[PDB]
Symmetry: C3
Amino acid sequence: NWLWYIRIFIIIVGSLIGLRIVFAVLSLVNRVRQGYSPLS
Amino acid sequence: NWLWYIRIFIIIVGSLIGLRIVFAVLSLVNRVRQGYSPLS
Amino acid sequence: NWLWYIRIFIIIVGSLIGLRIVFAVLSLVNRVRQGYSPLS
């Protein structure tokens, strides 16, 4: 049935969530992008 | 029978993951609202 | 092994997304690490 084409599609959405962990590491990198005051 | 209402429930949970991308701009906004020193 | 063991596997991945909401508190904890300068 079409249910298979719909099942594999969730595995692609599954790859997006494990990628988000870097957002924790992004804060120390933002230090350089935040080294400046709001609106320069 | 249970499985059908639970199948679409995956697509609703799927919408929440793209929303998180905005958390990157939240850090520069939080700099001012967290600009004060830890109380706890 | 069958389609049943493959169905619940998505529900375990569904629990990980609600855990990322908590990262908003990490910014006040990292603020101390944002008053600090990039290593090297």
